[PDB]
Amino acid sequence: LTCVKSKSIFGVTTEDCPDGQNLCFKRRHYIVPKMYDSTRGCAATCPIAENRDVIHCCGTDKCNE
Numbered sequence: 001l002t003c004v005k006s007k008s009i010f011g012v013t014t015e016d017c018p019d020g021q022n023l024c025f026k027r028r029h030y031i032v033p034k035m036y037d038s039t040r041g042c043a044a045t046c047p048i049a050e051n052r053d054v055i056h057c058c059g060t061d062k063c064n065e
Contacts, residue, residue, distance in 0.1 A: 001016070001017040001021070001022050001023075001024065001042065001059070001061060002015065002016050002017065002053075002061045002062055003017055003024035003025075003040065003041055003042045003061075003062065003063075003064055004024070004026075004040050004056075004062050004064050004065040005040055005041055005042075006040065007038075007040065007065055010011065010031055010057055012065070014062060015041065015042055017042035018042070019036065020044050021042040021043055021044045022044070022059065023043045023044070023045070023046055023057045023058070023059055024040070024041070024042060024043070024057065024058050024060075024062070024063050024064035025040065025041060025043050025046060025055055025056065025057045025064055026038060026039075026040045026055070026056045026064040027039045027040070027042070027047060027049075027054070027055045028054045028055075029053055029054055030052045030053075030054070031052075035047055036054075039044075040064045040065075041064075043057070044061050
């Protein structure tokens with residue numbers, strides 16, 4: 001599995017996930033309403049949506065882009 005690790009106006013980083021990490025995630029952490037910072041990566045289990053988080057997990061290559 002490959003997951004996007006960074007995606008910006010400057011470039012994109014893709015990671016081949018290590019053994020045991022067969023999910024990609026994209027986490028949107030909201031600072032104020034309708035404004036948020038996005039983090040992405042591989043994961044073994046879908047990360048917990050903590051305070052102010054919306055988290056999407058998926059299982060195909062670069063599905064979190």
